[PDB]
Design an enzyme around this catalytic site. Structure first.
Site, PDB file in Angstrom:
ATOM      1  N   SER A 104       0.865  -1.191   0.000  1.00  0.00           N
ATOM      2  CA  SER A 104       0.000   0.000   0.000  1.00  0.00           C
ATOM      3  C   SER A 104       0.890   1.226   0.000  1.00  0.00           C
ATOM      4  O   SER A 104       1.965   1.227   0.551  1.00  0.00           O
ATOM      5  CB  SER A 104      -0.829   0.010   1.286  1.00  0.00           C
ATOM      6  OG  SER A 104      -1.515   1.233   1.470  1.00  0.00           O
ATOM      7  N   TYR A 112      -2.244  -1.439  10.498  1.00  0.00           N
ATOM      8  CA  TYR A 112      -2.253  -1.875   9.111  1.00  0.00           C
ATOM      9  C   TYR A 112      -1.110  -1.238   8.314  1.00  0.00           C
ATOM     10  O   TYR A 112      -0.385  -1.954   7.616  1.00  0.00           O
ATOM     11  CB  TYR A 112      -3.618  -1.531   8.514  1.00  0.00           C
ATOM     12  CG  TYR A 112      -3.721  -1.670   7.027  1.00  0.00           C
ATOM     13  CD1 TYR A 112      -4.119  -2.843   6.433  1.00  0.00           C
ATOM     14  CD2 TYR A 112      -3.463  -0.577   6.232  1.00  0.00           C
ATOM     15  CE1 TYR A 112      -4.246  -2.901   5.016  1.00  0.00           C
ATOM     16  CE2 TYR A 112      -3.573  -0.625   4.870  1.00  0.00           C
ATOM     17  CZ  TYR A 112      -3.937  -1.778   4.275  1.00  0.00           C
ATOM     18  OH  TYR A 112      -4.047  -1.741   2.876  1.00  0.00           O
ATOM     19  N   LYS A 135       2.139  -2.935   6.257  1.00  0.00           N
ATOM     20  CA  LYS A 135       2.430  -2.630   4.858  1.00  0.00           C
ATOM     21  C   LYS A 135       3.870  -2.172   4.672  1.00  0.00           C
ATOM     22  O   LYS A 135       4.525  -2.545   3.707  1.00  0.00           O
ATOM     23  CB  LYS A 135       1.405  -1.666   4.274  1.00  0.00           C
ATOM     24  CG  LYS A 135      -0.060  -2.235   4.203  1.00  0.00           C
ATOM     25  CD  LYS A 135      -0.128  -3.559   3.466  1.00  0.00           C
ATOM     26  CE  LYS A 135      -1.517  -3.963   2.975  1.00  0.00           C
ATOM     27  NZ  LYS A 135      -1.476  -5.269   2.220  1.00  0.00           N
TER      28      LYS A 135
HETATM   29  N1  LIG Z   1      -8.656  -0.548  -1.546  1.00  0.00           N
HETATM   30  C1  LIG Z   1      -7.581   0.231  -1.407  1.00  0.00           C
HETATM   31  O1  LIG Z   1      -7.610   1.644  -1.410  1.00  0.00           O
HETATM   32  C2  LIG Z   1      -6.242  -0.381  -1.243  1.00  0.00           C
HETATM   33  C3  LIG Z   1      -5.213   0.505  -0.942  1.00  0.00           C
HETATM   34  C4  LIG Z   1      -3.975   0.012  -0.589  1.00  0.00           C
HETATM   35  C5  LIG Z   1      -3.807  -1.366  -0.525  1.00  0.00           C
HETATM   36  N2  LIG Z   1      -4.831  -2.240  -0.803  1.00  0.00           N
HETATM   37  C6  LIG Z   1      -4.510  -3.681  -0.706  1.00  0.00           C
HETATM   38  O2  LIG Z   1      -5.057  -4.417  -1.782  1.00  0.00           O
HETATM   39  C7  LIG Z   1      -5.243  -5.756  -1.384  1.00  0.00           C
HETATM   40  C8  LIG Z   1      -6.661  -6.189  -1.762  1.00  0.00           C
HETATM   41  O3  LIG Z   1      -7.645  -5.448  -1.039  1.00  0.00           O
HETATM   42  P1  LIG Z   1      -8.991  -4.871  -1.738  1.00  0.00           P
HETATM   43  O4  LIG Z   1      -9.125  -3.447  -1.321  1.00  0.00           O
HETATM   44  O5  LIG Z   1      -8.976  -5.158  -3.169  1.00  0.00           O
HETATM   45  O6  LIG Z   1     -10.103  -5.744  -0.946  1.00  0.00           O
HETATM   46  P2  LIG Z   1     -11.603  -6.216  -1.335  1.00  0.00           P
HETATM   47  O7  LIG Z   1     -12.124  -5.627  -2.636  1.00  0.00           O
HETATM   48  O8  LIG Z   1     -12.465  -5.971  -0.158  1.00  0.00           O
HETATM   49  O9  LIG Z   1     -11.331  -7.780  -1.475  1.00  0.00           O
HETATM   50  C9  LIG Z   1     -10.867  -8.486  -0.352  1.00  0.00           C
HETATM   51  C10 LIG Z   1     -10.621  -9.900  -0.820  1.00  0.00           C
HETATM   52  O10 LIG Z   1      -9.826 -10.558   0.144  1.00  0.00           O
HETATM   53  C11 LIG Z   1     -10.413 -11.809   0.501  1.00  0.00           C
HETATM   54  N3  LIG Z   1      -9.896 -12.127   1.818  1.00  0.00           N
HETATM   55  C12 LIG Z   1     -10.048 -11.410   2.984  1.00  0.00           C
HETATM   56  N4  LIG Z   1      -9.364 -12.013   3.981  1.00  0.00           N
HETATM   57  C13 LIG Z   1      -8.781 -13.132   3.448  1.00  0.00           C
HETATM   58  C14 LIG Z   1      -7.978 -14.143   3.976  1.00  0.00           C
HETATM   59  N5  LIG Z   1      -7.609 -14.151   5.249  1.00  0.00           N
HETATM   60  N6  LIG Z   1      -7.513 -15.164   3.189  1.00  0.00           N
HETATM   61  C15 LIG Z   1      -7.866 -15.183   1.866  1.00  0.00           C
HETATM   62  N7  LIG Z   1      -8.651 -14.193   1.320  1.00  0.00           N
HETATM   63  C16 LIG Z   1      -9.123 -13.199   2.111  1.00  0.00           C
HETATM   64  C17 LIG Z   1     -11.904 -11.555   0.340  1.00  0.00           C
HETATM   65  O11 LIG Z   1     -12.681 -12.706   0.144  1.00  0.00           O
HETATM   66  P3  LIG Z   1     -13.329 -13.536   1.367  1.00  0.00           P
HETATM   67  O12 LIG Z   1     -14.234 -12.573   2.152  1.00  0.00           O
HETATM   68  O13 LIG Z   1     -14.072 -14.641   0.706  1.00  0.00           O
HETATM   69  O14 LIG Z   1     -12.195 -14.077   2.220  1.00  0.00           O
HETATM   70  C18 LIG Z   1     -11.869 -10.749  -0.944  1.00  0.00           C
HETATM   71  O15 LIG Z   1     -11.668 -11.588  -2.071  1.00  0.00           O
HETATM   72  C19 LIG Z   1      -4.941  -5.823   0.118  1.00  0.00           C
HETATM   73  O16 LIG Z   1      -3.607  -6.278   0.360  1.00  0.00           O
HETATM   74  C20 LIG Z   1      -5.073  -4.370   0.525  1.00  0.00           C
HETATM   75  O17 LIG Z   1      -4.362  -4.107   1.709  1.00  0.00           O
HETATM   76  C21 LIG Z   1      -6.066  -1.769  -1.173  1.00  0.00           C
END
Ligand SMILES: NC(=O)c1ccc[n+]([C@@H]2O[C@H](COP(=O)([O-])OP(=O)(O)OC[C@H]3O[C@@H](n4cnc5c(N)ncnc54)[C@H](OP(=O)(O)O)[C@@H]3O)[C@@H](O)[C@H]2O)c1
Ligand SMILES: NC(=O)c1ccc[n+]([C@@H]2O[C@H](COP(=O)([O-])OP(=O)(O)OC[C@H]3O[C@@H](n4cnc5c(N)ncnc54)[C@H](OP(=O)(O)O)[C@@H]3O)[C@@H](O)[C@H]2O)c1
Ligand SMILES: NC(=O)c1ccc[n+]([C@@H]2O[C@H](COP(=O)([O-])OP(=O)(O)OC[C@H]3O[C@@H](n4cnc5c(N)ncnc54)[C@H](OP(=O)(O)O)[C@@H]3O)[C@@H](O)[C@H]2O)c1
Ligand SMILES: NC(=O)c1ccc[n+]([C@@H]2O[C@H](COP(=O)([O-])OP(=O)(O)OC[C@H]3O[C@@H](n4cnc5c(N)ncnc54)[C@H](OP(=O)(O)O)[C@@H]3O)[C@@H](O)[C@H]2O)c1
Lengths: 251, 251, 251, 251
Positions: C142, C155, C159
């Site tokens: 992130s 968090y 990261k």
């Molecule tokens: N959104 C942002 O602004 C942003 C910014 C910086 C970094 N990120 C990073 O991007 C990555 C993805 O996040 P996202 O924002 O795309 O999330 P998202 O759209 O909410 O998707 C989360 C996904 O993670 C799965 N998941 C949650 N806990 C899990 C576990 N313990 N084991 C396996 N799968 C799990 C969920 O499915 P289930 O519920 O079925 O487990 C779902 O498929 C993360 O590393 C996050 O920190 C996102």
């Protein structure tokens, strides 16, 4: 007195951060030679610091001029017998606006005073420091070198260049026992930064944007510089220290 | 073809990394104008790339000359109707030694070609990109910007300055839908870098010191540049990507 | 098809960034195994992607469970004969508040899923990649690793740890011809980040505070990941690429 | 005396860098409470520093234990009336080999002592610092956070996490007037680092490899820490200072 019997040059030291640095070095025991472009400013500064019982003299030195750089070093050598410390603090910024709109002439002025003069001033003191068994150089950059000030593009780029100059000088002068470090101030209240915080409205926008609780003062920079110029910092070289009150910089 | 119908300028593109970039952009569908200082080099490069079935033309452009920069842009506008992509790749290094010994003239040449010409080339293309609804600029720096190459101080400093320039340009050109990123190659086998990896003993010392398994080739840089110049990288700006085979850079 | 015949695992790939990555890898020719904690989310995702003509299967894998990690790799090996690519995307954040108030249990959960599970998942794939002559690992961190999000302290710290993990894995796995890189997204519109950009007032505050023109979408992250996982990126290892729309990160 | 009347806690302060820091804080006027796991080491250290005329007391404190942390703070409050300064210096590293082979048990131990104990120790002192109108926290990381030591991967990762922890604590504790900074030592001669400078072959090798003229001594770290814990550093927060003798770190 951590700098007892040491001789320091501080460029651009008749106001603001440069003056605070010169005062502190002298309070910590150094003989200091202050300088800037205007004789009246040099005269006033020397008189003030001499009035505080400090060992300070001064001369005019526009850092962009080779003859001025050489005369500044010659003054320290002739009054004190050598040079141990250089604080390179001069900067210019004749531009505000979009970086792409700055003329070639603006770039030449900024690169000459901010970058070239720094290295050429360092070249001027190195042989004297070698005679002393080593020495310390401190270059003044800016936190804008890491996280750029809006509308100060060319200046910001010159300050990023100084980060690299610090690192390259520190590597290349280590065999001569000369340490080279850098001060990167944040928003410090001075004449040079004044336009950014003159209005109470602009001042409060700066604090929110930079995420700081207060503006810095020149003396907030003086302690770290004196420390880095001292033998107690003998294992510190090639380092930039940000004095920015919490504003973002780098890991 | 991710760059279908796009028009790209690649400066210093008759050998090395600039040639590999020009080749790949054209393979990816762009109309590319290649250029460098010598007509014979331009002719040879154009012939080669045309012979590969690529939409390539060329002209002489010494990036340090205002007239040459203006004419390069005008050529692309006159042939193709506009400019979408600029890859600024030209650099000079007339110096090999301890940074403290470089003269004002060395600094002036390096800062003019490596830093100033980059921004002035960008200024020349921006109005054409604005007419097209946006564009991509890619500046070629070096891993030496982060971790200086020995004996290459002034050059290294100029490359650090380009990290800063990338950031400032990205912020300021975002409102015009122009992205600006930077490629920082590690030790790549080219004519420019030959001194470093020439002799077998110096090559093995460089690999051990840099902690790499192999030297890079110019084509190792081409894919990331093409990607960054594509609409698939539309949320990527202000970024430097190191292509260094695991050599150290930064967090 | 830059990933033709390659086999990829993408953890946490039933929504958001993980889903966008899995879709793109499969569009670029890879056989992909998706997974996440809930069978319902796996089933929905596999149906969608198979419906698009893509070579995708799925299984439940909670990355914090050793048995689940082992079974995920064994599934890829059974279906496709080996593993070429691992995208480690899972994260948890059970906390929203001042970092000083997070309990030991909050830290344990965050460090286990966000940091330990990443390295343990990598350990599980390494022997399979060795049998294939090498491979690619991409870790999702992130921009908060460099510039912390408000109320996201624990968090954000996890990261930052991933930046270090990337670097250490890239050095230590290079002899096995395994590259390791990192994606650092900025503010991307997903369920995970919803509270940050939900109401129009907070969204406008985030765009001003982050200095961005738009929020990102999951697909804005997919191209760079596919590229880094390709053989065209063979001289890129130990690198973090920020996909942040010009939000601040680092030089 | 820059720390006159101030009360400092230094964890892991019965040898090496922690002892040098405790000594220097006390020389600069502070009442210091030293601690470590073994009573014999505590007793020896307290005896030595008291013998030098320093205002020092000590107690056993294994930083991984909540009751030990609580009791350490309580001791300073009961003896002196409050706490102004925390130097968090404890670390463990029960692993030597390839990072991928570190077990869950290894990771748990490293993350608990090196990362969690640091934030939990900070939590323990914050209410006391608030009663004093503010205070200073200094976290000891390592240059390995930026450039990892061979064979020390999990340890290196924990040190990178501390860079992030410093930044997040500095932001989140600024409203309470608590500054948080970090010391990142390079190659300092101590018991903990002995493996990196074993005999004359590995000592002269790692000097060439790290590009340093000498190994550091624990006292080389003490001045910067005392400075950063003083009110003369009131505009410095969120900063990491490398004390590495010219070894590579970061811009
Ligand atoms: N959104 C942002 O602004 C942003 C910014 C910086 C970094 N990120 C990073 O991007 C990555 C993805 O996040 P996202 O924002 O795309 O999330 P998202 O759209 O909410 O998707 C989360 C996904 O993670 C799965 N998941 C949650 N806990 C899990 C576990 N313990 N084991 C396996 N799968 C799990 C969920 O499915 P289930 O519920 O079925 O487990 C779902 O498929 C993360 O590393 C996050 O920190 C996102
Ligand atoms: N103020 C800030 O917020 C702040 C922030 C970041 C960085 N800085 C950096 O701090 C350094 C000092 O700036 P400051 O804000 O403290 O400035 P200041 O208070 O306005 O003082 C400027 C000083 O520089 C002298 N000077 C100007 N041009 C010179 C030249 N060519 N040769 C020699 N002396 C010259 C001036 O005296 P004469 O008129 O007599 O020459 C004066 O002594 C600069 O490197 C600046 O970039 C300041
Ligand atoms: N090679 C490396 O290890 C390495 C590492 C890091 C960064 N880089 C960077 O990669 C970029 C390309 O260098 P390279 O190693 O690929 O060089 P190269 O193979 O030697 O090619 C140099 C090219 O630049 C042209 N050129 C030189 N000066 C010029 C000028 N003023 N205006 C226009 N064209 C000019 C040359 O053609 P003419 O003679 O006809 O002008 C030629 O096409 C540079 O920015 C360099 O700093 C290289
Ligand atoms: N030396 C280097 O090259 C170097 C380089 C980078 C970073 N560092 C960092 O500098 C810091 C100091 O290390 P050092 O090299 O100075 O170590 P050192 O000379 O070996 O001393 C270790 C000290 O820590 C105490 N200790 C160990 N575990 C503890 C625990 N769980 N709780 C409380 N005290 C504990 C030891 O006393 P007891 O046995 O009585 O507990 C002893 O006082 C560490 O954070 C280290 O990672 C050192």
């Amino acid at each position: 007195k951590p700098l007892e019997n040491k001789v320091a040059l501080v460029t651009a030291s008749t106001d603001g951060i440069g003056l605070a640095i010169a005062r502190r070095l002298a309070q910590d025991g150094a003989h200091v030679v202050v300088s800037s472009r205007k004789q009246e400013n040099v005269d006033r500064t020397v008189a003030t610091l001499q009035g505080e019982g400090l060992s300070v003299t001064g001369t005019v030195c526009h850092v962009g001029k080779a003859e001025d750089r050489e005369r500044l070093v010659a003054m320290a050598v002739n009054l004190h017998g050598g040079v141990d410390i250089l604080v390179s603090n001069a900067a210019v910024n004749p531009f505000f606006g979009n970086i792409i709109d700055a003329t070639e002439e603006v770039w030449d002025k900024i690169l000459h005073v901010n970058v070239k003069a720094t290295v050429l001033m360092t070249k001027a003191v190195v042989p004297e420091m070698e005679k002393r068994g080593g020495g310390s150089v401190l270059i003044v950059s800016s936190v804008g070198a890491y996280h750029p000030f809006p509308n100060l593009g060319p200046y910001n780029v010159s300050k990023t260049a100084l980060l690299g100059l610090t690192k390259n000088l520190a590597v290349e002068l280590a065999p001569r026992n000369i340490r080279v470090n850098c001060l990167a101030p944040g928003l410090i209240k001075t004449n040079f930064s004044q336009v950014l915080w003159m209005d109470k409205a602009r001042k409060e926008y700066m604090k929110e944007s930079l995420r700081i609780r207060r503006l810095g003062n020149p003396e907030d920079c003086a302690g770290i510089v004196s420390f880095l110029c001292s033998e107690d910092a003998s294992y510190i070289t090639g380092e930039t220290v940000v004095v920015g009150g919490g504003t973002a910089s780098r890991l």
